[PDB]
Write an enzyme that holds these catalytic residues in place. Structure first.
Site, short mmCIF file in Angstrom:
data_model
loop_
_atom_site.label_atom_id
_atom_site.label_comp_id
_atom_site.label_asym_id
_atom_site.label_seq_id
_atom_site.Cartn_x
_atom_site.Cartn_y
_atom_site.Cartn_z
N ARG A 151 1.44 -0.99 -0.08
CA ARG A 151 0.39 0.10 0.12
C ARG A 151 0.55 1.59 -0.07
O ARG A 151 0.03 2.63 -0.77
CB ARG A 151 -0.58 0.24 1.36
CG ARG A 151 -2.32 -0.98 1.16
CD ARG A 151 -3.10 -1.02 2.05
NE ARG A 151 -4.22 -1.02 1.73
CZ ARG A 151 -4.43 -2.84 0.97
NH1 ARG A 151 -3.79 -3.80 1.15
NH2 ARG A 151 -5.14 -2.92 1.10
N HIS A 327 -7.40 -15.99 -15.88
CA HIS A 327 -8.81 -15.67 -15.61
C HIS A 327 -9.79 -16.21 -15.57
O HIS A 327 -9.53 -16.13 -16.77
CB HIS A 327 -8.64 -14.27 -15.35
CG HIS A 327 -9.92 -14.23 -14.88
ND1 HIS A 327 -10.80 -13.53 -15.01
CD2 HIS A 327 -10.24 -13.59 -13.11
CE1 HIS A 327 -12.24 -13.85 -13.71
NE2 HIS A 327 -11.17 -13.07 -13.12
N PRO A 328 -10.82 -16.96 -15.47
CA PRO A 328 -11.66 -17.96 -16.68
C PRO A 328 -12.31 -16.65 -16.53
O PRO A 328 -13.22 -15.70 -15.94
CB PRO A 328 -12.01 -18.33 -14.81
CG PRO A 328 -10.99 -18.92 -14.01
CD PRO A 328 -10.82 -17.38 -14.69
N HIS A 356 -20.18 -22.02 -13.37
CA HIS A 356 -20.64 -20.63 -12.90
C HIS A 356 -20.29 -20.06 -14.55
O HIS A 356 -20.91 -19.15 -14.50
CB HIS A 356 -19.30 -19.65 -12.00
CG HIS A 356 -19.93 -18.24 -11.96
ND1 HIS A 356 -19.46 -17.23 -12.59
CD2 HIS A 356 -20.52 -17.32 -11.04
CE1 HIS A 356 -19.69 -16.12 -12.24
NE2 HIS A 356 -19.96 -16.59 -11.57
N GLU A 357 -19.23 -20.04 -15.21
CA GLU A 357 -18.70 -19.06 -16.89
C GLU A 357 -19.80 -20.03 -17.18
O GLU A 357 -20.78 -19.08 -18.59
CB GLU A 357 -17.67 -19.73 -16.84
CG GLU A 357 -16.29 -19.55 -16.02
CD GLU A 357 -16.25 -17.06 -15.91
OE1 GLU A 357 -17.12 -16.78 -16.92
OE2 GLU A 357 -15.54 -17.14 -15.57
N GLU A 384 -24.22 -11.78 -12.89
CA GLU A 384 -22.98 -12.53 -11.86
C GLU A 384 -24.14 -13.47 -11.33
O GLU A 384 -23.78 -14.32 -10.86
CB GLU A 384 -22.92 -11.51 -10.97
CG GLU A 384 -22.02 -10.32 -11.71
CD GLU A 384 -20.65 -10.79 -12.76
OE1 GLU A 384 -19.52 -12.10 -11.75
OE2 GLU A 384 -19.58 -10.23 -13.76
N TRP A 459 -12.07 7.58 6.01
CA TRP A 459 -12.27 5.87 5.16
C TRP A 459 -11.90 4.76 6.29
O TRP A 459 -13.40 4.20 6.64
CB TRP A 459 -10.97 6.13 4.07
CG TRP A 459 -11.06 4.74 3.71
CD1 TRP A 459 -12.51 4.32 2.80
CD2 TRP A 459 -10.33 3.23 3.81
NE1 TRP A 459 -12.10 3.34 1.95
CE2 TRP A 459 -11.24 2.20 2.53
CE3 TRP A 459 -9.42 3.31 4.23
CZ2 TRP A 459 -10.88 1.31 2.53
CZ3 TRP A 459 -8.64 1.77 3.78
CH2 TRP A 459 -8.85 1.33 2.38
N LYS A 463 -14.33 2.31 8.10
CA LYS A 463 -14.10 1.00 8.46
C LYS A 463 -14.53 0.30 9.69
O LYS A 463 -14.45 -0.93 9.80
CB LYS A 463 -12.91 0.59 7.69
CG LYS A 463 -12.26 -1.04 8.06
CD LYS A 463 -10.85 -1.59 7.26
CE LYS A 463 -10.68 -1.02 6.25
NZ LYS A 463 -11.29 -2.11 4.70
N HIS A 487 -10.87 -3.33 -9.56
CA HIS A 487 -11.98 -2.73 -9.76
C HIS A 487 -11.86 -1.12 -9.88
O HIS A 487 -12.34 -0.39 -10.55
CB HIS A 487 -13.33 -3.46 -9.40
CG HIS A 487 -13.57 -4.95 -9.21
ND1 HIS A 487 -12.58 -5.60 -8.09
CD2 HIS A 487 -14.55 -5.34 -10.27
CE1 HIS A 487 -12.74 -6.68 -9.01
NE2 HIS A 487 -13.86 -6.97 -10.10
#
Ligand SMILES: *[C@@H]1O[C@H](CO)[C@@H](O)[C@H](O)[C@H]1NC(C)=O
Ligand SMILES: *[C@@H]1O[C@H](CO)[C@@H](O)[C@H](O)[C@H]1NC(C)=O
Ligand SMILES: *[C@@H]1O[C@H](CO)[C@@H](O)[C@H](O)[C@H]1NC(C)=O
Ligand SMILES: *[C@@H]1O[C@H](CO)[C@@H](O)[C@H](O)[C@H]1NC(C)=O
Ligand SMILES: *[C@@H]1O[C@H](CO)[C@@H](O)[C@H](O)[C@H]1NC(C)=O
Ligand SMILES: *[C@@H]1O[C@H](CO)[C@@H](O)[C@H](O)[C@H]1NC(C)=O
Lengths: 596, 99, 50
Positions: A151, A327-328, A356-357, A384, A459, A463, A487
């Site tokens: 980080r 990655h699938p 899932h896919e 999803e 933040w 948390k 993301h």
């Protein structure tokens, strides 16, 4: 003649000239993903530039047709989707700066390599160098070192970039008649023009808080149990009254708690439901895995896979000579071409990922009859969620016994159901406060409620208040701790996982009521039920033609996202956690009592 | 990609039965005159098919032959093959020779 | 040919054997409207438009 007929002919021309181009762009992206070579990168970039320029020219043609003179709902939906400026409303210098910022964040995240000071001769990348350390280590200071060093490097690189990013995205969104970029993201759930089924951008935050207020007792009990178990694992670091230390959650960011299942198992002495050894003993190839998944989808009444799926998909790692993304991913390339790119191993996780896919593939196949610009999910949550319901159904011991992968003399007592439900809670329930806190923080950043000098003080306060996780040491404003995740650094919405999680159990209750299952919800399997598949396919065939509220009425009979199916799914586990938390203290304190 | 196959996408009215339209005049969808140039609300009516071998079965090319059979007052000359039974001699049989 | 410029071939003054077409395994659609395929090889027509 009329404006509506002009728009209909323009939409026919658009779908026609955007289908072949989308197929070429998707095929170039596929050829890049299955073959990482520089000419495939160049072909992908050329196809993407042609696709974006064509979309710019078609949006420019599309805006000249006013919206209020069109009465057909599907035509108005396609014109609403097409007439969005995107970055085109912004100036060319600022648009180029935004694109450059997005690309350099992608390169910083992808090629970010961090290792220990005074030992710089070799370093570890995030995947898989840091993932394995975060998921498997039991040492406090090693995980603390990895977390703080990653980080430090990533946040100190990304903080001015994120400060430019928020201003540019807010400028683009207010240039697009939105309040902020958060309102732009919330506009995916906006339904306008339908009587009764209208949904507003401002109703989304209220609905998320209303569902999370019912999430909160279950998460408090789960957090207390995980706190007690991590106190057993690490004797002195964790306080009975305080929050959990950040680097001990089993993942890099706290996204999932599923890597703490070994430490927090209720009954380790009892066996697991692992079916890996049975497939190794029967020599199950990945082709057999996908054929069993296809047998599952034909058992419920959904269509089976195309010939082009079996011919054109890559279901096995190609080799050393040929490079591919691990990655699938399920690809709807267009023109009836559906493929899965997965480096499938013989594991339970890869089998559930295959289900899932293939659920993604079934969802893509279902709206193939729809027009091109309506070929999406009704919202980002459904796409999803229809894969996650297959992940729910395939993971059940009844499904494993039915396909022969589990021994018929396996004893299903209450303890195995409790530890399976706890594993599903660590995967599913644990991501909900992190997702809600991250999206609410990003919404407050875009709205301007939080000034730039106070981003992190709020933040960590969020948390502690929501996630119940305390920072190991305080961070100043030189850090950028959110943007270390994939993301958020690459401009992706994050509320899709929250909506996916609630829609998952809503769809599960609807299909189990359709399948007439008479036991617990987690013991339910949707195989062999034609009516459940029909109820699913009625919503699946619509795509984006209908509102998501009307689609949810079509499946579950409700006009809004609901939290009660999740609580019903984990109700045995909820009672067990309430029984186990008699001596311990439920809830946490936001003060710095454990460590800071 | 095989783009050697074009279709008519827009016409003002539906075709009559067994009609062929090979006109390449710009379709006028709007009030403005096209003036022979493909601009806004004015589209070229012939559009190419995209045929790739990896496409789905609903997008793969299909060759269609339509046979139209009509009977007119003229003597019908396109006849089917007239199956002939082997010839048997010296027995009382029912003969059918050319009708 | 393309569907906008579909080829029309006029078939006259010959013998049309339809059982060769009907018994082929290479055709996916053989949908006949107004007549059945079994009596095509018997009946006679003035002209055939292909
Ligand atoms: C991947 O790319 C290499 C180099 O361009 C090529 O030789 C190889 O045939 C490709 N693989 C496949 C499966 O086409
Ligand atoms: C809307 O348009 C679609 C095709 O674009 C058509 O099939 C549908 O019937 C139309 N709906 C109404 C209510 O006119
Ligand atoms: C797109 O930008 C143009 C140029 O400012 C504007 O006229 C138009 O209204 C915008 N479209 C939307 C949907 O905001
Ligand atoms: C899918 O099902 C149909 C109908 O039973 C069958 O004809 C077809 O062969 C199946 N496709 C595959 C790839 O098995
Ligand atoms: C399972 O059931 C038995 C008998 O009903 C009980 O003694 C035991 O505590 C139960 N275990 C759990 C985890 O609920
Ligand atoms: C579902 O159908 C398949 C095929 O008939 C069968 O093998 C399987 O046992 C069925 N499932 C159950 C739970 O009976």
């Amino acid at each position: 003649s009329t404006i509506e007929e002009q728009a209909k002919t323009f939409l026919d021309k658009f779908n026609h000239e955007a289908e072949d181009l989308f197929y070429q762009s998707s095929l170039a992206s596929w050829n890049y993903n299955t073959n990482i070579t520089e000419e495939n990168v160049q072909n992908m970039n050329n196809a993407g530039d042609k696709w974006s320029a064509f979309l710019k020219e078609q949006s420019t043609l599309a805006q000249m047709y006013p919206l209020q003179e069109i009465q057909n709902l599907t035509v108005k939906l396609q014109l609403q989707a097409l007439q969005q400026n995107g970055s085109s409303v912004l100036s060319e210098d600022k648009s180029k700066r935004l694109n450059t910022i997005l690309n350099t964040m992608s390169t910083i995240y992808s090629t970010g390599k961090v290792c220990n000071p005074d030992n710089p001769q070799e370093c570890l990348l995030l995947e898989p160098g840091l993932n394995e350390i975060m998921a498997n280590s039991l040492d406090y200071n090693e995980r603390l070192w990895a977390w703080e060093s990653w980080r430090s490097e990533v946040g100190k690189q990304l903080r001015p970039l994120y400060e430019e990013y928020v201003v540019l995205k807010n400028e683009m969104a207010r240039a697009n008649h939105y309040e902020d970029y958060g309102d732009y993201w919330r506009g995916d759930y906006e339904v306008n023009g339908v009587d009764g089924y209208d949904y507003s951008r401002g109703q989304l935050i209220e609905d998320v808080e209303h569902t999370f207020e019912e999430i909160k007792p279950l998460y408090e009990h789960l957090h207390a149990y995980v706190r007690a178990k991590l106190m057993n694992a690490y004797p002195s670091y964790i306080s009975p009254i305080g929050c959990l230390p950040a680097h001990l959650l089993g993942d890099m960011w706290g996204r999932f708690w599923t890597n703490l299942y070994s430490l927090t198992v209720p009954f380790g002495q009892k066996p697991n439901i692992d079916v890996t050894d049975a497939m190794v003993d029967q020599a199950w190839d990945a082709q057999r895995i996908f054929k069993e998944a296809e047998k599952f989808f034909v058992s419920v009444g959904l269509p089976n896979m195309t010939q082009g799926f079996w011919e054109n998909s890559m279901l096995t790692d190609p080799g050393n000579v040929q490079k591919a993304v691990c990655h699938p991913t399920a690809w709807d390339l267009g023109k009836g071409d559906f493929r899965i790119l997965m480096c499938t191993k013989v594991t339970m996780d890869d089998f559930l990922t295959a289900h899932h896919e293939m659920g993604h593939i079934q969802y893509d196949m279902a709206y193939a009859a729809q027009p091109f610009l309506l070929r999406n999910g009704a919202n980002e949550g459904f796409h999803e969620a229809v894969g996650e319901i297959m992940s729910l159904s395939a993971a059940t011991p009844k499904h494993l016994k039915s396909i022969g992968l589990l021994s018929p003399d396996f004893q299903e007592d209450n303890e195995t159901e409790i530890n399976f439900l706890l594993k599903q809670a660590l995967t599913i329930v644990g991501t909900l406060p992190f997702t809600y806190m991250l999206e609410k923080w990003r919404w407050m950043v875009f709205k301007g409620e939080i000034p730039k000098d106070q981003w992190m003080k709020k933040w960590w306060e969020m948390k502690r208040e929501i996630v119940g996780v305390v920072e190991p040491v305080p961070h100043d404003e030189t850090y950028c701790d959110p943007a270390s995740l994939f993301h958020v650094s690459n401009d992706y919405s994050f509320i899709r996982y929250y909506t996916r999680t609630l829609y998952q159990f809503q769809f599960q209750e609807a299909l189990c009521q359709a399948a007439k299952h008479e036991g617990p919800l987690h013991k339910c399997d949707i195989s062999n039920s034609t009516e459940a598949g029909q109820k699913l396919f009625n919503m699946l065939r619509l795509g984006k033609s209908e509102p998501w509220t009307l689609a949810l009425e079509n499946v579950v009979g409700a006009k809004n996202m609901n939290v009660r199916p999740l609580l019903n799914y984990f109700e045995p586990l909820f009672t067990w956690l309430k029984d186990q938390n008699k001596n311990s203290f439920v809830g946490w304190s936001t003060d710095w009592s454990p460590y800071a | 990609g095989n783009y050697n196959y074009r279709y008519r996408l827009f016409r003002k009215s539906n075709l009559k039965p067994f009609e062929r339209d090979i006109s390449t005049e710009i379709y006028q969808a709007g009030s403005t005159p096209c003036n022979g140039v493909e601009g806004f609300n004015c589209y070229f009516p012939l559009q190419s098919y995209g045929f790739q071998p990896t496409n789905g079965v609903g997008y793969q090319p299909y060759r269609v032959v339509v046979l139209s059979f009509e009977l007119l007052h003229a003597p019908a000359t396109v006849c089917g093959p007239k199956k002939s039974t082997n010839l048997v001699k010296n027995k009382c049989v029912n003969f059918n020779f050319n009708g | 040919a393309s569907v906008y410029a579909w080829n029309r071939k006029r078939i006259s003054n010959c013998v049309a054997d339809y059982s060769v077409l009907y018994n082929s395994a290479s055709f996916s659609t053989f949908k006949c409207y107004g007549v059945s395929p079994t009596k095509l090889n018997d009946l006679c027509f003035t002209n055939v438009y292909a």
